Coordinates of C-alpha atoms in Angstrom, one line a residue:
Chain A
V1 CA -40.8 3.3 6.0
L2 CA -38.6 1.4 3.3
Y3 CA -35.2 1.3 4.9
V4 CA -32.3 -0.4 2.9
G5 CA -29.0 0.0 5.0
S6 CA -25.8 -1.4 3.4
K7 CA -22.5 -1.0 4.8
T8 CA -23.9 2.2 7.0
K9 CA -21.4 2.7 10.0
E10 CA -22.9 4.3 13.1
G11 CA -20.4 4.5 16.1
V12 CA -17.5 2.8 14.5
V13 CA -13.8 3.3 15.3
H14 CA -11.6 1.4 13.1
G15 CA -8.1 1.2 11.7
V16 CA -6.1 2.8 14.8
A17 CA -2.7 1.6 14.9
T18 CA 0.5 2.8 16.7
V19 CA 4.1 2.1 15.9
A20 CA 6.7 2.2 18.6
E21 CA 10.1 1.4 16.7
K22 CA 12.7 1.6 19.7
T23 CA 10.8 3.7 22.0
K24 CA 11.9 4.3 25.6
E25 CA 9.4 5.2 28.1
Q26 CA 9.4 5.8 31.9
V27 CA 6.3 6.8 33.9
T28 CA 6.5 7.3 37.8
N29 CA 2.9 8.3 38.4
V30 CA 2.0 8.9 42.1
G31 CA -1.7 9.1 43.0
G32 CA -2.8 10.1 39.5
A33 CA -4.1 8.8 36.3
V34 CA -1.8 8.0 33.4
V35 CA -2.7 6.7 30.1
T36 CA 0.0 6.0 27.4
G37 CA -1.6 3.2 25.5
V38 CA -4.2 3.4 22.3
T39 CA -7.6 3.3 23.6
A40 CA -10.1 2.8 20.6
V41 CA -13.7 3.0 21.8
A42 CA -16.8 3.4 19.9
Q43 CA -20.6 3.5 21.1
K44 CA -23.9 3.6 19.6
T45 CA -27.2 4.2 21.7
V46 CA -31.0 4.4 21.4
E47 CA -32.7 6.6 24.1
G48 CA -29.3 7.2 25.6
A49 CA -29.7 10.4 27.3
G50 CA -26.9 11.8 29.0
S51 CA -24.2 9.1 27.8
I52 CA -20.6 9.3 27.7
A53 CA -18.3 7.3 25.5
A54 CA -14.7 7.9 26.8
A55 CA -13.3 8.6 30.3
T56 CA -9.7 7.8 29.3
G57 CA -7.1 8.8 32.0
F58 CA -8.9 11.0 34.4
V59 CA -9.2 11.9 38.0
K60 CA -12.6 12.4 39.6
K61 CA -12.8 13.8 43.1
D62 CA -16.0 15.4 43.1
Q63 CA -17.3 16.5 46.5
Chain B
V1 CA -40.6 6.7 3.3
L2 CA -38.3 5.2 0.7
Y3 CA -34.9 5.6 2.3
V4 CA -31.6 3.9 1.1
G5 CA -28.6 4.3 3.5
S6 CA -25.8 2.9 1.5
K7 CA -22.2 3.2 3.1
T8 CA -23.4 6.1 5.1
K9 CA -21.0 6.9 8.2
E10 CA -22.7 8.8 11.3
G11 CA -20.2 9.0 14.1
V12 CA -17.2 7.3 12.8
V13 CA -13.5 7.7 13.6
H14 CA -11.1 5.7 11.3
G15 CA -7.6 5.8 10.0
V16 CA -6.0 7.0 13.3
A17 CA -2.2 6.3 13.5
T18 CA 0.8 7.0 15.3
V19 CA 4.6 6.3 14.5
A20 CA 7.3 6.6 17.3
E21 CA 10.6 6.0 16.0
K22 CA 13.6 6.7 18.5
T23 CA 11.0 8.3 20.7
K24 CA 12.3 8.8 24.3
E25 CA 9.7 9.8 26.9
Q26 CA 9.5 10.4 30.8
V27 CA 6.4 11.2 32.8
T28 CA 6.4 11.9 36.3
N29 CA 2.7 12.6 37.1
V30 CA 2.0 13.4 40.5
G31 CA -1.8 13.7 41.4
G32 CA -3.1 14.9 38.0
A33 CA -4.1 13.4 34.6
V34 CA -1.5 12.8 31.7
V35 CA -2.4 11.2 28.5
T36 CA 0.0 10.4 25.7
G37 CA -1.7 7.2 23.9
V38 CA -3.7 7.6 20.6
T39 CA -7.4 7.9 21.7
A40 CA -9.9 7.4 18.7
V41 CA -13.6 7.6 20.0
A42 CA -16.9 7.5 18.0
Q43 CA -20.6 7.9 19.4
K44 CA -24.0 7.9 17.6
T45 CA -26.6 8.6 20.5
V46 CA -30.2 8.7 19.6
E47 CA -32.5 10.8 22.0
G48 CA -29.1 11.4 23.9
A49 CA -29.8 14.7 25.4
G50 CA -26.5 16.1 27.0
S51 CA -24.3 13.5 25.9
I52 CA -20.4 13.7 26.1
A53 CA -18.0 11.9 23.9
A54 CA -14.6 11.9 25.3
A55 CA -13.0 12.7 28.8
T56 CA -9.5 12.2 27.8
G57 CA -6.9 13.2 30.4
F58 CA -8.7 15.9 32.6
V59 CA -9.3 16.4 36.3
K60 CA -12.9 16.9 37.6
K61 CA -12.9 18.5 41.4
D62 CA -16.4 20.1 41.5
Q63 CA -18.4 20.6 44.4
Chain C
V1 CA -40.2 10.6 0.7
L2 CA -37.7 9.4 -1.7
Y3 CA -34.3 9.8 0.0
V4 CA -31.0 7.9 -0.9
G5 CA -27.7 8.7 1.0
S6 CA -24.6 7.2 -0.9
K7 CA -21.2 7.4 1.2
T8 CA -22.5 10.3 3.3
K9 CA -20.5 11.4 6.5
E10 CA -22.2 12.8 9.5
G11 CA -19.7 13.4 12.4
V12 CA -16.7 11.8 11.0
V13 CA -13.1 12.0 11.9
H14 CA -10.4 10.1 9.7
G15 CA -7.0 10.2 8.6
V16 CA -5.2 11.2 11.8
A17 CA -1.5 10.4 12.1
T18 CA 1.3 11.5 13.8
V19 CA 5.2 10.7 13.0
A20 CA 7.7 11.2 15.9
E21 CA 11.3 10.5 14.6
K22 CA 13.8 11.3 17.2
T23 CA 11.6 13.0 19.7
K24 CA 12.1 13.5 23.2
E25 CA 9.8 14.6 25.6
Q26 CA 9.4 15.1 29.3
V27 CA 6.1 15.8 31.3
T28 CA 6.1 16.6 34.9
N29 CA 2.4 17.3 35.7
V30 CA 1.5 17.9 39.3
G31 CA -2.2 18.1 40.1
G32 CA -3.2 19.2 36.4
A33 CA -4.1 17.7 32.9
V34 CA -1.4 17.2 30.5
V35 CA -2.7 15.7 27.0
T36 CA 0.3 15.3 24.6
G37 CA -0.9 12.4 22.2
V38 CA -3.4 11.9 19.5
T39 CA -7.3 12.2 19.9
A40 CA -9.7 11.9 17.2
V41 CA -13.4 12.0 18.7
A42 CA -16.5 12.1 16.4
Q43 CA -20.2 12.3 17.1
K44 CA -23.4 12.2 15.7
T45 CA -26.5 13.1 18.2
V46 CA -30.0 13.2 17.5
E47 CA -32.3 14.9 20.0
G48 CA -29.1 15.7 22.0
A49 CA -29.5 19.2 23.6
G50 CA -26.3 20.6 25.2
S51 CA -24.1 17.7 23.8
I52 CA -20.2 17.9 24.2
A53 CA -17.6 16.0 22.0
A54 CA -14.3 16.8 23.6
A55 CA -13.2 17.1 27.2
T56 CA -9.5 16.9 26.4
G57 CA -6.7 18.0 28.9
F58 CA -8.8 20.4 31.0
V59 CA -9.4 21.0 34.7
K60 CA -13.1 21.4 36.1
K61 CA -13.2 22.9 39.4
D62 CA -16.8 24.3 39.5
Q63 CA -18.5 25.4 42.7
Chain D
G1 CA -16.3 -11.7 -14.7
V2 CA -18.7 -10.3 -12.2
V3 CA -22.2 -9.1 -12.3
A4 CA -24.9 -7.9 -10.0
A5 CA -28.6 -6.5 -11.0
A6 CA -31.8 -5.9 -9.5
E7 CA -35.0 -6.7 -11.8
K8 CA -38.8 -6.3 -11.4
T9 CA -38.1 -4.6 -8.0
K10 CA -39.9 -1.5 -6.5
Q11 CA -36.6 -0.1 -4.9
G12 CA -33.4 -1.8 -6.2
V13 CA -29.8 -1.8 -4.9
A14 CA -27.0 -3.2 -7.0
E15 CA -23.5 -3.7 -5.5
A16 CA -19.7 -3.0 -6.0
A17 CA -17.9 -6.3 -6.0
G18 CA -14.9 -4.1 -5.3
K19 CA -12.0 -4.1 -2.8
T20 CA -12.4 -2.3 0.6
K21 CA -9.5 -1.9 2.9
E22 CA -10.8 -0.8 6.4
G23 CA -8.1 -1.6 9.0
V24 CA -4.5 -2.1 9.9
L25 CA -2.0 -3.5 7.5
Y26 CA 1.4 -3.4 8.9
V27 CA 4.3 -4.3 6.4
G28 CA 7.7 -4.5 7.9
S29 CA 9.0 -4.4 4.3
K30 CA 7.2 -4.7 1.2
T31 CA 10.5 -5.0 -1.0
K32 CA 11.0 -6.2 -4.6
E33 CA 14.5 -6.8 -5.1
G34 CA 15.4 -7.9 -8.4
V35 CA 12.3 -9.1 -10.1
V36 CA 10.8 -9.3 -13.7
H37 CA 7.2 -8.9 -14.8
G38 CA 4.8 -9.2 -17.6
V39 CA 7.2 -10.7 -20.5
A40 CA 4.8 -13.5 -22.2
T41 CA 5.4 -13.9 -26.2
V42 CA 2.1 -14.8 -28.0
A43 CA 3.7 -16.3 -31.3
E44 CA 1.3 -16.6 -34.4
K45 CA 1.8 -17.8 -37.8
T46 CA 5.6 -17.9 -37.4
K47 CA 8.2 -19.9 -39.8
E48 CA 11.4 -20.0 -37.8
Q49 CA 14.2 -21.8 -39.2
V50 CA 17.4 -23.2 -37.5
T51 CA 20.4 -24.8 -38.8
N52 CA 23.2 -25.3 -36.1
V53 CA 26.3 -27.2 -37.0
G54 CA 28.1 -26.8 -33.8
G55 CA 27.3 -23.8 -32.0
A56 CA 23.9 -22.6 -29.9
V57 CA 20.7 -21.4 -30.8
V58 CA 17.7 -20.4 -28.4
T59 CA 14.2 -19.2 -29.3
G60 CA 12.8 -18.7 -25.8
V61 CA 11.5 -15.6 -24.0
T62 CA 14.4 -14.5 -22.2
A63 CA 14.0 -13.2 -18.6
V64 CA 16.8 -13.0 -15.8
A65 CA 16.3 -12.5 -12.1
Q66 CA 18.9 -12.6 -9.6
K67 CA 20.2 -11.2 -6.2
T68 CA 23.9 -12.4 -5.5
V69 CA 26.5 -14.2 -7.3
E70 CA 30.1 -14.7 -5.8
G71 CA 33.5 -16.0 -7.2
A72 CA 36.4 -14.4 -9.1
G73 CA 35.6 -13.8 -12.5
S74 CA 31.8 -15.2 -12.3
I75 CA 29.5 -14.3 -15.2
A76 CA 25.7 -13.9 -14.4
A77 CA 23.8 -13.3 -17.5
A78 CA 25.1 -14.6 -20.6
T79 CA 22.6 -14.4 -23.5
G80 CA 24.7 -15.0 -26.5
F81 CA 27.8 -15.9 -25.0
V82 CA 30.8 -17.6 -26.5
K83 CA 33.6 -18.0 -24.1
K84 CA 36.8 -19.2 -26.1
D85 CA 39.8 -18.1 -24.3
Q86 CA 43.2 -19.3 -25.3
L87 CA 45.5 -20.4 -22.4
Chain E
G1 CA -14.8 -7.5 -16.2
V2 CA -17.4 -6.1 -13.6
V3 CA -21.0 -5.1 -14.1
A4 CA -23.9 -3.8 -11.8
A5 CA -27.0 -2.3 -13.0
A6 CA -30.4 -1.9 -12.2
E7 CA -33.3 -2.6 -14.8
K8 CA -37.1 -2.9 -14.9
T9 CA -37.5 -1.4 -11.7
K10 CA -39.2 1.5 -9.7
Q11 CA -36.2 3.0 -7.7
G12 CA -32.7 2.2 -8.0
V13 CA -29.1 2.9 -6.7
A14 CA -26.0 0.9 -7.9
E15 CA -22.5 0.4 -7.1
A16 CA -19.4 -0.1 -9.3
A17 CA -16.4 -1.8 -7.8
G18 CA -14.6 1.1 -6.7
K19 CA -11.7 0.5 -4.3
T20 CA -11.7 2.0 -0.9
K21 CA -8.7 2.3 1.4
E22 CA -10.4 3.7 4.7
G23 CA -7.7 2.9 7.5
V24 CA -4.1 2.6 8.4
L25 CA -1.5 1.1 6.0
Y26 CA 1.9 1.1 7.7
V27 CA 4.6 0.3 5.5
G28 CA 8.4 0.1 6.7
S29 CA 10.2 0.2 3.3
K30 CA 8.2 -0.3 -0.1
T31 CA 11.4 -0.7 -2.2
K32 CA 12.0 -1.7 -5.7
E33 CA 15.7 -2.6 -6.0
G34 CA 16.6 -3.4 -9.7
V35 CA 13.2 -4.3 -11.2
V36 CA 12.7 -4.5 -14.9
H37 CA 9.2 -4.3 -15.5
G38 CA 6.3 -3.7 -18.0
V39 CA 7.8 -5.6 -21.1
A40 CA 5.7 -7.9 -23.0
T41 CA 6.0 -9.6 -26.4
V42 CA 3.7 -10.3 -29.3
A43 CA 5.2 -12.1 -32.3
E44 CA 3.3 -12.4 -35.5
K45 CA 4.5 -13.5 -39.3
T46 CA 8.0 -14.4 -37.9
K47 CA 10.3 -15.5 -40.6
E48 CA 13.5 -16.2 -38.6
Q49 CA 16.5 -17.9 -40.4
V50 CA 19.2 -19.0 -38.4
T51 CA 22.7 -20.4 -39.8
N52 CA 25.3 -21.1 -37.1
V53 CA 28.8 -22.7 -37.8
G54 CA 29.8 -22.2 -34.1
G55 CA 28.7 -19.0 -32.4
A56 CA 25.6 -18.2 -30.4
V57 CA 22.1 -17.1 -31.5
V58 CA 19.4 -16.1 -29.3
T59 CA 15.8 -14.7 -30.4
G60 CA 14.4 -14.3 -26.8
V61 CA 13.6 -10.6 -25.4
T62 CA 16.5 -10.2 -23.0
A63 CA 15.5 -8.6 -19.8
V64 CA 18.0 -8.8 -16.8
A65 CA 17.4 -7.9 -13.3
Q66 CA 20.0 -8.2 -10.8
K67 CA 21.1 -7.0 -7.2
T68 CA 24.9 -8.1 -6.4
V69 CA 27.7 -9.7 -8.1
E70 CA 31.0 -10.6 -6.5
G71 CA 34.7 -11.4 -7.6
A72 CA 37.5 -9.9 -9.4
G73 CA 36.7 -9.3 -13.0
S74 CA 33.0 -10.3 -12.5
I75 CA 30.7 -9.7 -15.5
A76 CA 26.7 -9.2 -14.8
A77 CA 24.9 -8.8 -18.2
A78 CA 26.5 -9.9 -21.3
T79 CA 23.5 -9.9 -24.3
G80 CA 25.7 -10.6 -27.5
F81 CA 29.1 -11.1 -25.8
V82 CA 32.1 -12.8 -27.6
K83 CA 34.8 -13.5 -25.1
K84 CA 38.1 -15.0 -26.6
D85 CA 41.0 -13.3 -24.9
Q86 CA 44.3 -14.8 -25.8
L87 CA 46.9 -16.0 -23.2
Chain F
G1 CA -14.3 -3.7 -18.3
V2 CA -16.6 -2.2 -15.6
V3 CA -20.1 -0.8 -16.4
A4 CA -22.7 0.1 -13.7
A5 CA -25.7 2.1 -14.6
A6 CA -29.5 2.3 -13.6
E7 CA -32.5 2.8 -15.7
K8 CA -36.3 3.1 -15.4
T9 CA -36.3 4.7 -11.9
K10 CA -37.7 7.4 -9.8
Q11 CA -34.4 8.7 -8.8
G12 CA -31.3 7.0 -10.1
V13 CA -27.7 6.7 -8.4
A14 CA -24.9 5.0 -10.0
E15 CA -21.2 4.7 -8.9
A16 CA -18.6 4.8 -11.3
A17 CA -15.2 2.6 -10.1
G18 CA -13.5 5.4 -8.6
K19 CA -10.8 4.7 -6.1
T20 CA -10.6 6.4 -2.4
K21 CA -7.8 6.7 0.0
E22 CA -9.5 7.9 3.2
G23 CA -7.1 7.1 6.1
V24 CA -3.3 6.9 7.0
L25 CA -0.9 5.3 4.6
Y26 CA 2.5 5.6 6.1
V27 CA 5.4 4.5 3.8
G28 CA 8.8 4.4 5.4
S29 CA 10.5 4.4 1.8
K30 CA 8.9 4.1 -1.5
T31 CA 12.1 3.9 -3.4
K32 CA 12.8 2.6 -7.1
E33 CA 16.7 1.8 -6.8
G34 CA 17.7 1.1 -10.5
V35 CA 14.5 -0.3 -12.1
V36 CA 13.3 -0.4 -15.7
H37 CA 9.7 0.4 -16.4
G38 CA 7.3 1.2 -19.5
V39 CA 9.6 -0.4 -22.1
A40 CA 7.5 -2.7 -24.2
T41 CA 7.8 -4.2 -27.7
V42 CA 5.6 -6.2 -30.3
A43 CA 7.4 -8.0 -33.3
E44 CA 5.4 -8.2 -36.6
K45 CA 6.4 -9.3 -40.2
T46 CA 10.0 -9.7 -39.4
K47 CA 12.4 -11.3 -41.6
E48 CA 15.4 -12.1 -39.7
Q49 CA 18.6 -13.7 -41.3
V50 CA 21.9 -14.8 -39.4
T51 CA 25.1 -16.2 -40.9
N52 CA 27.3 -16.6 -37.9
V53 CA 30.7 -18.1 -37.8
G54 CA 31.7 -17.8 -34.1
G55 CA 30.2 -14.6 -33.4
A56 CA 27.3 -13.8 -31.3
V57 CA 23.7 -12.6 -32.6
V58 CA 20.9 -11.7 -30.3
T59 CA 17.6 -10.5 -31.4
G60 CA 15.9 -9.4 -28.4
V61 CA 14.8 -6.1 -26.7
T62 CA 17.6 -5.4 -24.2
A63 CA 16.5 -4.1 -20.7
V64 CA 19.0 -4.2 -17.7
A65 CA 18.3 -3.6 -14.0
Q66 CA 21.0 -3.8 -11.5
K67 CA 22.2 -2.7 -8.0
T68 CA 25.7 -3.5 -7.4
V69 CA 29.0 -5.1 -8.8
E70 CA 32.5 -5.0 -7.4
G71 CA 35.9 -6.6 -8.4
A72 CA 39.0 -5.7 -10.2
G73 CA 37.9 -4.4 -13.6
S74 CA 34.3 -5.8 -13.4
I75 CA 31.8 -5.4 -16.1
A76 CA 28.1 -4.7 -15.3
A77 CA 26.3 -4.2 -18.9
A78 CA 27.7 -5.6 -22.1
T79 CA 25.2 -5.4 -24.8
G80 CA 27.3 -6.2 -28.1
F81 CA 30.6 -6.9 -26.5
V82 CA 33.7 -8.2 -28.1
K83 CA 36.2 -9.1 -25.4
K84 CA 39.4 -10.3 -27.1
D85 CA 42.2 -8.7 -25.2
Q86 CA 45.7 -10.1 -25.8
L87 CA 48.2 -11.0 -23.1

């Protein structure tokens, strides 16, 4: 009834670093899903029935 | 009735780092899902019946 | 009725680091699911009947 | 000088005035490499007397900071030095 | 100075300037390399009396911080040095 | 000077200026490599007298920080040195 929010976080992704000092990487993906980078994904819903926040690097072949 | 939310976190991801000095990596993915990068995902779902949050590096082949 | 929350945490992931000096790695995934990196997934759900938070590096082949 | 309050209120919230650091802060190298800190003399009711008839007198607040000197026989910090070589 | 109160109210909650570090802080090298630190002087009722007929007198607070010197027979810190070699 | 309270309330909450560190703090090398710390001096009611003829008198508080010297027969710290070699 008397709501006082102050710096309240709801669905927050923060401070997501990566450091790659002299990193060698080779990818030869053929027909699939490959993720090697940083994915920082935050979400918030109201009346969000059946909601997903990440679908990183996946292969969907539903029949 | 008298609610004071102060600095309250609810579905929060933070401070997710990676350091990769001298790293060598090879990925030869064929038809699948490969994940190496840092994934940081938060979600605050209201009225979210049946809510996924991550789907990182998987293979869905239902029927 | 008289509720004050100060710096609370409901569904929080924080401080997740990896350090990989001199690290060599190979992944030869063929039709599967290889997760090798950081994941950090937090969730707070209200009225979320049947809520999943991680789907990391698996294979779903339901029939 | 900071101040915060909440007066004649039904449901009050004061505040910090304090630092937060919520995010990346890459530093390549946060190096001090020969520094000094803090030395500050506060003099009060002093009665110094100096009588020099051909030398050297200093009444400072000494502090030296260097990184590199070069050269044969060089001298870097010489507080109270008297160099009188016969040749 | 920091203040944060709550007065003449009906409900209250206050903060206080507390630091928070909620995130990533990479540092490559947080090095101190010859750092004299923490000294601080207060002089009161000083009664210096100096009489010099060809020397050196210092009344600081000697605090040296270096990293590198170069040269044959070099000298780095020389508080109270007399240097009178005969050739 | 930090103060943070709460008075005349139905339910009182008060923070207290406390540090938090909730996250990654990578440091590659948090090294001191020859530093000075914690030394401090305050002078009071001193009665220094000097009668110098060609010497050296320092009335500091010595504190040397240093990393590297080289050269043939070098000298690094020389508090109270009388270098008068004959040749």
